[PDB]
UniProtKB/Swiss-Prot annotation:
GO biological process terms held by the UniProt record: cell division; cellular response to nitric oxide; cellular senescence; centriole replication; centrosome duplication; chromatin remodeling; DNA repair; DNA replication
PANTHER family linked to this entry: CELL DIVISION PROTEIN KINASE, CYCLIN-DEPENDENT KINASE 2
Origin organism lineage: Eukaryota, Metazoa, Chordata, Craniata, Vertebrata
Originating species: Homo sapiens (Human)
Stated consequence of mutating residue 9 to F: Reduced phosphorylation by CAK
Similarity comment: Belongs to the protein kinase superfamily. CMGC Ser/Thr protein kinase family. CDC2/CDKX subfamily.
InterPro entries, A to Z: CDK, Kinase-like_dom_sf, Prot_kinase_dom, Protein_kinase_ATP_BS, Ser/Thr_kinase_AS
Post-translational modification comment from the UniProt entry: Phosphorylated at Thr-143 by CDK7 in a CAK complex. Phosphorylation at Thr-143 promotes kinase activity, whereas phosphorylation at Tyr-15 by WEE1 reduces slightly kinase activity. Phosphorylated on Thr-14 and Tyr-15 during S and G2 phases before being dephosphorylated by CDC25A. Nitrosylated after treatment with nitric oxide (DETA-NO).
GO cellular component: Cajal body; centrosome; chromosome, telomeric region; condensed chromosome; cyclin A1-CDK2 complex; cyclin A2-CDK2 complex; cyclin E1-CDK2 complex; cyclin E2-CDK2 complex
Name used for this protein in its record: Cyclin-dependent kinase 2
Modified residues (Phosphothreonine): 14, 143
């Protein structure tokens, strides 16, 4: 740790604080997260190297603290969306970012690694048009964030403890809808409000669309029964290729939900390109 100099605080989580830091004996600018089974599960993340995954450079265990050293990126997608809120991110750039994240997930998922907590703030962007997955899934000062449950898959909210890679596809579908509309798809402020916001839009799930849903640990037969609203209302003015892909990413049944690998073949990406975003750093 004596090999690093703090420059500023760049973030916070339930169990850690993140700083922008400088490596004294290499000159590298990194992001440093300060926090036996964990030491091994995080050492496996060091081998999960892909152009669309923020590089985990090192793991340092020093005097009852764990430090994670990552490659530094200047902006996150949440800030870029907040900065593009009045104009909207151009469709070619939304498509490029979605494609790149599906490539990163196809990679993680093939190595049996789930992210579990995809949200705009852990999607980092650079000046080259790249987007990368960060912070693969207590400090008393951590401030509760409005967006915390907004991207949670319904199986997680329904108490499934052995959920699959499909939970990441759900979170990315929510992010895709948000880039298009400039508003959060399911802005829930509690587990039940999050569940009911999903139900209000996609219809209350039942055994027809999600076999086994009524046997989930937190499923209650007393949940109000909302009709599925027609999908053209959910992400206007996104085209039919985009709406079709999004509907597949938001299927209730995790087994019907499109995989990252199949999503890359979707006709929506036939004209995918890699535009350069305009970033003000
Ligand atoms: C999500 O990423 C992580 C999570 C855990 C972790 F351990 C490391 C990383 C991580 C890895 C690599 N590179 C990174 N870069 C960054 C940020 C760079 C600048 N962001 C800005 C500051 C200014 C704000 C506006 C204002 O406050 O005025 C608008 C947002 C914050 C986040 C975080 C981060």
């Amino acid at each position: 740790m004596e090999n690093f100099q703090k420059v500023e605080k760049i973030g916070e989580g339930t169990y850690g604080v993140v700083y922008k830091a400088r490596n004294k004996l290499t000159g590298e600018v990194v992001a440093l997260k300060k926090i036996s089974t964990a030491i091994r599960e995080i050492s496996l993340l060091k081998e999960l190297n892909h152009p669309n995954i923020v590089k985990l450079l090192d793991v340092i265990h020093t005097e009852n603290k764990l430090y994670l050293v990552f490659e530094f990126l200047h902006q996150d997608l949440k800030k870029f969306m907040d900065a593009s809120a009045l104009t909207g991110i151009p469709l070619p750039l939304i498509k490029s970012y979605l494609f790149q994240l599906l490539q990163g997930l196809a990679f993680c998922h093939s190595h049996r690694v789930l992210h579990r907590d995809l949200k705009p703030q852990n999607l980092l962007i650079n000046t080259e048009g790249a987007i990368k997955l960060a912070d693969f899934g207590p400090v008393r000062t951590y401030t509760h964030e409005v967006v915390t449950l907004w991207y949670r898959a319904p199986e997680i909210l329904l108490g499934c403890k052995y959920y699959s890679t499909a939970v990441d596809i759900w979170s990315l579908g929510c992010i895709f809808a948000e880039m298009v509309t400039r508003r959060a798809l399911f802005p829930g402020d509690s587990e039940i409000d999050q569940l009911f916001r999903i139900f209000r839009t996609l219809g209350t799930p039942d055994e027809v669309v999600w076999p086994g849903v009524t046997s989930m640990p937190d499923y209650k037969p007393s949940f109000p029964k909302w009709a599925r609203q027609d999908f053209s209302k959910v992400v206007p003015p996104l085209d039919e290729d985009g709406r079709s892909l999004l509907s597949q990413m938001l299927h209730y049944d995790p087994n019907k939900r499109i995989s990252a690998k199949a999503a890359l073949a979707h006709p929506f990406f036939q004209d995918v390109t890699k535009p350069v975003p305009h970033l003000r750093l």
